[PDB]
């Protein structure tokens, strides 16, 4: 009974949260990806000389 | 290694030394028999561990006839078996222990369920596992004397009606053994080694040695390519 | 971690002597070992090296063929057999443990020194200590300059310059390894800077205890060559 | 009565999630230019494990990496030179996880022995010996990640997570919200929160300082095997045994997108993110590793070459390479 | 007559070279010589490939009726042919011993059977064979008889004693010792397999045991049936001189061709019937 009460209280606490629009989160995600797109080595190829890993 | 510096060459040498140590330890490990151990407390798994020996997993390293045997006890863990069951895909054999006298005892749960019919389901779920399809299973039947007294005192018909045999020790034991063998759904790939646990340590250890020896013969033939 | 050397005393020229260094409190079998000599009133000099597992062995050319290095790992002992000693070998010999991997600190721990008195290289990189003595007061930041005969910048980009401090009457200790990393147990007063062929050690907020003979070492290729040694004084 | 109230609360949360979600992520990301095809060539091959590797973790210097094998070895690798840096013999033969500290001073491993072992690598003596044993878990250790050199979060098969103080030797904080085995955990860049997925098909977000569950994410049909934060700390991807991966946003608190393909029905072992987070790399049980475009939800590349089933996958800190560990005892670096 | 014998040598050489090269190629491409048994197979294929490569020179000698290649090439051909025969025969012996140790001594099979030890034993087999091939190589010359040069062995006085000693040593070492080793090892191995509880009790498993025993018998039968006529023929010819006839020449070359056919068929019987290789062939 105590465990069920704790679970109900946890659900009540979780419900009382500051929901934000999915569009906002999507815009933040796309903005972060675009901003760090050039920096990412995997996304954009890097010259072999600059690249630390080279054929041995 | 002219281009490589002195520190680079020394690092490569340290790497080669590590490679040598790892190869030697792998050659040691390749001569070690790795045995999985399964069963519960009522089954008498601890008893076989004590007899053979001379928190998550209990390791009981031992030697018999100059062969190294490694037994891992995973029974203590209460975590879900499926998540770590694939961790043992490189095991020579699986020793599974049950107790002959388990059928009379019924767990005091909300509903009454026979223990022996739980152990049958446990054996089925282990035996038909995809990871252990080719692995052999040694089957130990503990508490033989107590089974004899229990079978003579109380008939086995009461638990499961299907059995029509008389209240005879040997007949009941043979029926239990044949039912466990029948549980396997892939007989052609998987040998099952059934045995009645003796008070003498040496007989049980010898039976384990023989089963392991057969598994080693199967592995050697597969490597040779006869199978 | 401890290293103690035995086998000292006087020797006649043309004789033979075996030194032995006993190591305690570390994994002797995993460290490479060095013998480094020090002339009485002159700088240090590298004598020999044996890798861990004895796979590669190096000697200075002045001691090539005369000196034989060996190690016994089950007894944690390093041996140096010396045959046909000459009057230039009257020096104090130190044993050095060194481990080589990415991020390792080789030459970190130095032995105690066994004094031996024998009573009667264009290709090799040369380290140039331009100054010989600098008079300093406790508190001021002091700069020490070292130069090389060859660019110590390898293709990987890690410079092979080491900075050592020898206090008066004590074993030398490692200060900076690879010119950018401080040795474990050294205060942050010391900093290394510079570029290929020109190197600088800056001691900000100096203390009297810090004062000692400073050595710059290259570790690009064998044989290892030390610097002259900049002394500080009060 | 209490169960009915719980169901009512869950229904209210579901209604809030449905009302909150107005525009689909796929529709918004439709106009972004596609990444086409991504091809990563093998750079380094690591050998000598001789057993099924289960765990690899990159250091913050982007050069060293730790690896855990089932022969009782932790191997610390120099990725640029292919040389082995350290070889730690383990007390427990079975190891399911291994964490490399950001500083690199300590290495944490764990598995079926119920212990998390911390190994000091900067010892003056020079032999990697057991520094601290975190004994106290009732189930198998499944994942562990260092926050600092003194505090570590571990997940276990007793349905709980724990925050352990290395110097104290005791678990400072206990997290008990899950109903199934917790299979993975991921630390955010700020490190103030950590999300973990369990065998009840749910993930939970736990506050390290406070000690309670902030958010609960459902939507998977089977056991969640892997979890990793998006690089900004506001989202995380999960992979499950239902042959799907999902993206959950902490602020949105709902399933943003699902990455599944019809041909591949095998479960996802491990998931990792790129430096920009645009590419999501998941190691499937089909002997390959798929690179999925996060925004587009298509498949951008395939890393084939591991004969045995892949068990772990990690992108390095600067994003310059991805190293995959498989059960064939070969660690392969893809760039 | 001569054309038929030349065609027989040709066909045997082509099949032998194709089989040996293909087996070596398969081992290098996929197996990478990781295991012991595969190294033994590669060794057998190598020796047999060399012997098949040495077969056309013999066919040309039979047709032409004289050796125009020269003394040096004749020495190379002789040495390589004898060296291959001994190497192939010993490799077969070593494989029989390996399988005997594996089946009969399971505990010790792990320690004794390693790739390193297999490489050492194979090198030893090549060394032991050297002792045969090299003296035979210097002795082997080209002597013109009745206007036709013959590439054959020459022995210093006493010629009869050296001839008899070489024939007896080659005979016993290449026939009596290998047949006995192979027979005893495989027979004990079959008995041990019968003792194994895995094979018995199931019709499919018993069938698998019958298949294994049948394959072992086929390998032993092939080796004995092919090697026995040429060795017996050499012993008969040497002991009692018989007047030269066309039938004698045809029988001599037929026995030699049968021995080369055995050399060609040993890699097939071993590698092709090997289950791991069978798996690889099945996949493609
Ligand atoms: C005519 O002699 C010449 C001429 C050119 S090469 C050469 C030597 N070939 C001889 C090759 C032989 C052979 C045949 C088949 C299989 C294996 N071994 C012929 C028979 O005797 C043996 C020696 C003892 C028994 C087998 C070698």
For chain E, how big is the Rg over CA atoms in Å?
Answer: 21
**CB of E255 closer than 6 angstroms to any ligand 1 atom:** no
* Selected residue of E31, E97, E275 to mutate for chain B interface (largest B Cβ count, 10 A): E275
Whether residue C165 sits in one domain with residue C90: no
Residues in chain C: 234
Return all residues near D235 (Cβ < 8 A) that are at least 6 apart.
Answer: A25, A29, D229, D247, D248, D249, D250, D256
Kindly list the domain boundaries of chain D, sorted by start residue.
1-334
Neighbours of C50 (CB within 10 A): 21
State the Cα–Cα distance between residues B53 and C50, nearest whole angstrom: 46
Structural domain includes residue C108: yes
Cβ C64 vs Cβ C48: under 8 Å = no
Phi, psi at B70, each rounded to 5°: -120, 120
* Residue E21 CA to ligand 1 centre (angstroms): 22
Q: What fold, for B32-224?
A: Rossmann fold (3.40.50)
* C51·B7 Cβ contact <8 A: no
Structural domain includes residue C62: yes
State the Cα–Cα distance between residues D201 and D220, nearest whole angstrom: 5
In chain C the first and final C-alpha atoms are separated, in Å, by: 32
Retrieve residue C13's tokens: 């020229």
**CB of E12 closer than 6 angstroms to any ligand 1 atom:** no
CATH 3.40.50.150 describes domain D1-334: no
Report the gap between the CA of D252 and the closest CA in chain B (Å): 31
Residue C89: helix, strand or coil by DSSP? Answer: helix
Q: List Cα–Cα distances, C216 to C160, C182, D165, in angstroms.
A: 10, 14, 42
Strand duo D322-326 + D310-315: pairing: antiparallel
Retrieve residue E58's tokens: 């013999």
Give the residue among E281, E262, E229 at the shortest CA–CA distance from E47.
Answer: E262
State the Cα–Cα distance between residues D61 and D80, nearest whole angstrom: 12
Retrieve residue B199's tokens: 């008070």
* CATH number of the domain residue C197 falls in: 2.60.40.10
Residue E170: helix, strand or coil by DSSP? Answer: helix
Kindly list the domain boundaries of chain B, sorted by start residue.
1-30, 32-224
- Measure CA E40 to chain center: 13
Neighbours of B174 (CB within 10 A): 13
**A-D contacts (CB, under 8 Å):** 147
> Would you tell me the crossing angle of helices E71-104 and E115-139 to the nearest 10 degrees?
150
**Category of D284 on φ-ψ map: left (φ > 0), alpha (ψ -120 to 50) or beta:** beta
Cβ C192 vs Cβ C121: under 8 Å = no
For residue E226, what is the enclosing H or E element? Answer: helix E203-239
Which of E 164-203 lie inside 8 A of B, CB atoms? Answer: 192, 196-198, 202
Neighbours of D9 (CB within 10 A): 18
Resolution of the structure in the document, Å: 3.2
Report the gap between the CA of B131 and the closest CA in chain D (Å): 13
Cβ B128 vs Cβ B185: under 8 Å = yes
Q: Which residues pair with C49 in a beta bridge?
A: C34, C58
Give the residue among D262, D264, D258, D241 at the shortest CA–CA distance from D294.
Answer: D258
Exposure string over E254-266, b if 16+ CB within 10 A, otherwise e: ebbbbbbbbbbbb
The chain B residue lying nearest C106, using CA atoms, is B7
Give the residue among E206, E198, E205, E255 at the shortest CA–CA distance from E228.
Answer: E255
* B213·E106 Cβ contact <8 A: yes
Q: List Cα–Cα distances, C64 to C49, C60, C67, C230, in angstroms.
A: 12, 6, 6, 29
Q: Which residues pair with C114 in a beta bridge?
A: C93
Phi, psi at B148, each rounded to 5°: -55, -50
Retrieve residue D312's tokens: 């772990």
Phi, psi at C46, each rounded to 5°: -80, 130
State the Cα–Cα distance between residues E37 and E46, nearest whole angstrom: 14
* B13·C55 Cβ contact <8 A: yes
**CB of E199 closer than 6 angstroms to any ligand 1 atom:** no
State the Cα–Cα distance between residues D314 and D282, nearest whole angstrom: 9
Q: Which residues pair with C21 in a beta bridge?
A: C5, C78
Cβ D48 vs Cβ D84: under 8 Å = yes
Structural domain includes residue C221: yes
State the Cα–Cα distance between residues E48 and C106, nearest whole angstrom: 55
Minimum-distance CB partner of D275 among A13, A18, A40: A40
Residue E153: helix, strand or coil by DSSP? Answer: strand
Tokens 């730790």 locate to D66
Cβ D174 vs Cβ D162: under 8 Å = yes
Which residues from chain D sit within 8 angstroms of residue C27, using beta carbons?
A: 125-127
Looking at the 3D structure of chain C, how many domains does it have?
2
Residue E220: helix, strand or coil by DSSP? Answer: helix
**CB of E189 closer than 6 angstroms to any ligand 1 atom:** no
Give the residue among C126, C103, C100 at the shortest CA–CA distance from C180.
Answer: C103
> Would you tell me the crossing angle of helices B115-127 and B169-183 to the nearest 10 degrees?
40
**CB of E61 closer than 6 angstroms to any ligand 1 atom:** yes
> Strand D193-198's sheet: what is its strand order?
D182-187, D193-198, D203-207, D213-217
Interchain contact B83–D (C-beta under 8 A): yes
Interchain contact E110–B (C-beta under 8 A): yes
Helices (H), B98-143: 115-127
Retrieve residue C189's tokens: 């007063």
Residue D107: helix, strand or coil by DSSP? Answer: strand
* Residue E9 CA to ligand 1 centre (angstroms): 13
CA C155-C31-C187 angle, to 5 degrees, is 75
CA pseudo-torsion sign E2, E3, E8, E13? positive
**CB of E260 closer than 6 angstroms to any ligand 1 atom:** yes
State the Cα–Cα distance between residues B208 and B95, nearest whole angstrom: 9
Environment class of C121 (CB within 10 Å of its CB; exposed 0-12, middle 13-18, buried 19+): exposed
Which residues from chain A sit within 8 angstroms of residue D321, using beta carbons?
A: 41, 52-53
Return all residues near D30 (Cβ < 8 A) that are at least 6 apart.
Answer: none
**CB of E262 closer than 6 angstroms to any ligand 1 atom:** no
State the Cα–Cα distance between residues D118 and D108, nearest whole angstrom: 5
State the Cα–Cα distance between residues D173 and A31, nearest whole angstrom: 36
State the Cα–Cα distance between residues E275 and D286, nearest whole angstrom: 25
Retrieve residue B29's tokens: 């490990």
- Measure CA C136 to chain center: 25
Retrieve residue C129's tokens: 């200590």
Q: Tell me the CB-side half-sphere exposure of residue E283, using CA atoms within 13 A.
A: 7
Strand duo C172-177 + C181-182: pairing: antiparallel
State the Cα–Cα distance between residues B131 and B91, nearest whole angstrom: 10
Residue B120: helix, strand or coil by DSSP? Answer: helix
Strand duo B93-99 + B136-142: pairing: parallel
Structural domain includes residue C122: no
State the Cα–Cα distance between residues D225 and D240, nearest whole angstrom: 5
Q: List Cα–Cα distances, C162 to C1, C182, C226, D85, E227, in angstroms.
A: 21, 10, 10, 21, 73
Cβ E183 vs Cβ E190: under 8 Å = no
Retrieve residue D114's tokens: 């119920």
Give the residue among C118, C144, C88, C134 at the shortest CA–CA distance from C11.
Answer: C118
What CA dihedral angle connects D271, D84, D126 and C173, to 10 degrees? -110
Retrieve residue A16's tokens: 């009382």
Cβ E208 vs Cβ E194: under 8 Å = no
**CB of E89 closer than 6 angstroms to any ligand 1 atom:** no
* Residue D301 CA to ligand 1 centre (angstroms): 61
Q: List Cα–Cα distances, E113 to E100, E117, E130, in angstroms.
A: 11, 7, 25
**CB of E182 closer than 6 angstroms to any ligand 1 atom:** no
> Would you tell me the crossing angle of helices E159-171 and E203-239 to the nearest 10 degrees?
170
DSSP E235-277: HHHHHS-----HHHHHHHHHHHHHHHHHHHHHHIIIIITSHHH
State the Cα–Cα distance between residues E284 and B206, nearest whole angstrom: 44
Retrieve residue E140's tokens: 């082997």
Phi, psi at E153, each rounded to 5°: -85, 140
Protein residue with least CA distance to atom 7, ligand 1:
E78
Minimum-distance CB partner of D85 among C25, C97, C102: C102
DSSP 8-state class, residue B152: H
State the Cα–Cα distance between residues E260 and D84, nearest whole angstrom: 51
List Cβ<8 Å contacts ≥24 apart for B109-116: B114/B159, B114/B160, B115/B42, B116/B159
Q: Tell me the CB-side half-sphere exposure of residue D285, using CA atoms within 13 A.
A: 13
Query: Which chains touch C (3+ CB pairs under 8 A)?
Result: B, D
For residue E171, what is the enclosing H or E element? Answer: helix E159-171
* C220·B16 Cβ contact <8 A: no
Which structural domain range is residue C143 located in?
127-232
Interchain contact D86–C (C-beta under 8 A): yes
* C100·B3 Cβ contact <8 A: no
State the Cα–Cα distance between residues B206 and B105, nearest whole angstrom: 31
Cβ E133 vs Cβ E80: under 8 Å = yes
Tokens 């570790």 locate to C219
For chain B, how big is the Rg over CA atoms in Å?
Answer: 22
**CB of E259 closer than 6 angstroms to any ligand 1 atom:** yes
Q: Tell me the CB-side half-sphere exposure of residue E132, using CA atoms within 13 A.
A: 24
Phi, psi at D128, each rounded to 5°: -75, 110
Which residues from chain A sit within 8 angstroms of residue D275, using beta carbons?
A: 36, 39-42
State the Cα–Cα distance between residues A41 and D43, nearest whole angstrom: 14
Q: Tell me the CB-side half-sphere exposure of residue D47, using CA atoms within 13 A.
A: 5
Cβ B102 vs Cβ B96: under 8 Å = no
Return all residues near B146 (Cβ < 8 A) that are at least 6 apart.
Answer: B100, B101
For residue B23, what is the enclosing H or E element? Answer: helix B6-29
In chain B the first and final C-alpha atoms are separated, in Å, by: 46
Which residues from chain D sit within 8 angstroms of residue A2, using beta carbons?
A: none
CA C192-C195-C199 angle, to 5 degrees, is 50
CA pseudo-torsion sign D5, D9, D14, D19? positive
Cβ D189 vs Cβ D275: under 8 Å = no
Q: Do chains D and E touch (3 or more CB pairs under 8 A)?
A: no
Numbered residues of chain B with Cβ closer than 8 Å to any chain C Cβ: 3, 5-11, 13-14, 16-17
The two most distant CA atoms of chain A are separated, in Å, by: 66
SS3 content of chain A, % helix, strand, coil (to 5): 50, 0, 50
Q: Which residues pair with B192 in a beta bridge?
A: B137
Substitution candidate for ligand 1 out of E256, E257, E263 with most atoms within 8 A of CB: E256
Strand duo C77-83 + C16-24: pairing: antiparallel
**CB of E234 closer than 6 angstroms to any ligand 1 atom:** yes
* Residue E264 CA to ligand 1 centre (angstroms): 15
Exposure string over E74-92, b if 16+ CB within 10 A, otherwise e: bbbbbbbbbbbbbbbbbbb
Return all residues near C125 (Cβ < 8 A) that are at least 6 apart.
Answer: C148, C149, C150, C152, C218, C220, C221, C225
Q: List Cα–Cα distances, C105 to C31, C97, C192, C213, D79, in angstroms.
A: 11, 10, 15, 21, 19
For residue D86, what is the enclosing H or E element? Answer: strand D84-89
């Amino acid at each position: 009974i105590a465990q069920a009460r704790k679970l109900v209280e946890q659900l009540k606490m979780e419900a009382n949260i500051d929901r934000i629009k999915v569009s906002k989160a999507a815009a933040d995600l796309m903005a972060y990806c675009e901003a760090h797109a050039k920096e990412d080595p995997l996304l954009t190829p890097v010259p072999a000389s600059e690249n630390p890993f080279r054929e041995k | 290694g002219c281009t490589l510096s002195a520190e680079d060459k020394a690092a490569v040498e340290r790497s080669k030394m590590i490679d040598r140590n790892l190869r030697e330890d792998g050659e040691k490990a390749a001569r070690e028999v790795k045995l999985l151990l399964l069963g519960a407390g009522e089954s008498g798994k601890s008893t076989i561990v004590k007899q053979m020996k001379i928190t998550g997993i209990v390791e009981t390293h031992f030697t018999f006839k100059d062969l190294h045997f490694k037994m891992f006890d995973v029974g203590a863990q209460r975590s879900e078996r499926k998540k770590w069951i694939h961790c043992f895909e490189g095991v020579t054999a699986i020793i599974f222990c049950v107790a002959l006298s388990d059928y009379d005892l019924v767990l005091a749960e909300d509903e009454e369920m026979n223990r022996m019919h739980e152990s049958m389901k446990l054996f089925d779920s282990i035996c038909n596992n995809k990871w252990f399809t080719d692995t052999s299973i040694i089957l130990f039947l503990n508490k033989k004397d107590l089974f004899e007294e229990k079978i003579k005192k109380s008939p086995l018909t009461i638990c499961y009606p299907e059995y029509a045999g008389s209240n005879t020790y040997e007949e009941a034991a043979a029926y239990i053994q044949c039912q466990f063998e029948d549980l396997n759904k892939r007989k052609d790939t998987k040998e099952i080694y059934t045995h009645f646990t003796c008070s003498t340590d040496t007989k049980n250890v010898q039976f384990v040695f023989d089963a392991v020896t057969d598994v080693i013969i199967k592995n050697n033939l597969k490597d040779c390519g006869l199978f | 971690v401890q290293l103690v050397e035995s086998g000292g005393g006087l020797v006649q020229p043309g004789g033979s002597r075996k030194l032995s260094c006993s190591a305690s409190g570390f994994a002797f079998s995993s460290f490479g070992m060095h013998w480094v000599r020090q002339a009485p009133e002159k700088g240090l000099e590298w004598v020999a090296y044996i890798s861990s597992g004895s796979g590669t062995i190096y000697y200075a050319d002045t001691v090539k063929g005369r000196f034989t290095i060996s190690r016994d790992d089950p007894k944690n002992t390093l041996f140096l057999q010396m045959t046909s000693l000459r009057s230039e070998d009257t020096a104090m010999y130190y044993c050095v443990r060194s481990i080589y991997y990415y991020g390792s600190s080789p030459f970190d721990f130095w032995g105690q020194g066994t004094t031996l008195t024998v009573s009667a290289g264009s290709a090799d990189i040369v380290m140039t200590q331009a100054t010989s003595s600098v008079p300093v007061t406790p508190g001021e930041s002091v700069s020490i300059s070292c130069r090389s005969s060859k660019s110590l910048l390898h293709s990987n980009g890690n410079t092979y310059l080491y900075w050592f401090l020898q206090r008066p009457g004590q074993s030398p200790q490692l200060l900076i390894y690879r010119m950018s990393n401080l040795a474990s147990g050294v205060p942050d007063r010391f900093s290394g800077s510079g570029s290929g062929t020109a190197f600088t050690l800056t001691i900000s907020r100096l203390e009297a205890e810090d004062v000692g003979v400073y050595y710059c070492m290259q570790h690009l290729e064998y044989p290892l060559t030390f610097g002259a040694g900049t002394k500080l004084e009060l | 009565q209490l169960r009915q109230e719980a169901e009512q609360l869950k229904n209210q949360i579901r209604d809030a999630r449905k009302a909150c979600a107005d525009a689909t992520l796929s529709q918004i990301t439709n106009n972004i230019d596609p990444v086409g095809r991504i091809q990563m060539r093998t750079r380094r091959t690591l050998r000598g494990h001789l057993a099924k590797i289960y765990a690899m973790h990159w250091g913050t210097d982007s050069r060293l990496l730790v690896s855990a094998s089932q022969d009782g070895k932790l191997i610390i690798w120099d990725s640029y030179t292919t040389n082995k840096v350290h070889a730690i013999p383990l007390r427990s033969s079975w190891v399911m996880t291994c964490a490399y500290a950001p500083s690199g001073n300590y290495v944490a491993c764990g598995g079926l022995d119920n212990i998390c072992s911390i190994y000091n690598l900067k010892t003056r003596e020079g032999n990697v010996r057991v520094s601290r044993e975190l004994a106290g878990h009732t189930g198998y250790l499944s994942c562990c990640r260092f926050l600092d050199d003194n505090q570590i979060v571990t997940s276990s098969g007793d349905t709980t997570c724990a925050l352990w103080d290395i110097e104290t030797g005791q678990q400072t904080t206990t997290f008990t919200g899950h109903t199934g085995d917790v299979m993975s955990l991921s630390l955010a860049p700020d490190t103030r929160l950590f999300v973990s997925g369990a065998c009840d098909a749910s993930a939970k977000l736990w506050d390290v300082r406070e000690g309670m569950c902030r958010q609960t994410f459902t939507g998977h049909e089977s056991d969640i095997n892997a979890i990793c934060f998006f690089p900004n700390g506001n989202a995380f991807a999960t992979g499950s045994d239902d042959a799907t991966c999902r993206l959950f946003d902490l602020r949105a608190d709902q399933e943003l997108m699902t990455y599944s393909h019809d041909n591949i029905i095998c479960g996802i072992t491990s998931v990792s993110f790129s430096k920009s987070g645009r590419l999501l790399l998941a190691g499937y049980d089909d002997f390959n590793c798929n690179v999925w475009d996060a925004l587009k939800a298509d498949r951008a590349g395939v890393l084939a070459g591991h004969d045995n089933r892949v068990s772990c996958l990690g992108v390095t800190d600067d994003g310059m390479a991805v190293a995959t560990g498989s059960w064939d005892s070969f660690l392969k670096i893809w760039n | 007559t001569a054309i038929t014998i030349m065609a027989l040598y040709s066909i045997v050489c082509v099949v032998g070279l194709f089989g040996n090269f293909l087996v070596m190629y398969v081992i290098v491409r996929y197996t990478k010589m990781k295991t012991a048994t595969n190294i033994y197979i590669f060794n057998l294929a190598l020796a047999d490939a060399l012997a098949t490569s040495t077969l056309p020179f013999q066919s040309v000698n039979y047709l032409m009726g004289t050796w125009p290649f020269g003394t040096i090439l004749c020495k190379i051909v002789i040495s390589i042919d004898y060296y291959n025969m001994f190497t192939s025969i010993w490799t077969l012996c070593t494989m029989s011993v390996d399988r005997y140790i594996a089946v009969c001594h399971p505990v010790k099979a792990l320690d004794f059977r390693t790739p390193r030890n297999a490489k050492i034993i194979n090198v030893c087999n090549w060394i032991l064979s050297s002792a045969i091939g090299l003296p035979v190589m210097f002795m082997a010359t080209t002597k013109y008889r009745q206007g036709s040069i013959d590439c054959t062995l020459t022995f210093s006085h006493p010629t009869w004693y050296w001839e008899n000693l070489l024939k007896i040593c080659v005979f016993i070492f290449a026939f009596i010792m290998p047949v006995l080793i192979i027979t005893v090892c495989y027979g004990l191995m079959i008995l041990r397999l019968k003792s194994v509880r895995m094979l018995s009790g199931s019709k499919e498993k018993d069938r698998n045991l019958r298949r294994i025993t049948r394959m072992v018998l086929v390998v032993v039968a092939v080796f004995i049936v092919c090697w026995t006529p040429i060795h017996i023929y050499v012993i008969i010819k040497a002991l009692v001189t018989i007047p030269e006839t066309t039938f004698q020449t045809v029988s001599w070359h037929f026995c030699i061709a049968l021995g080369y056919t055995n050399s060609c068929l040993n890699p097939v019987l071993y590698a092709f019937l090997d289950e791991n290789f069978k798996r690889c062939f099945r996949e493609f």
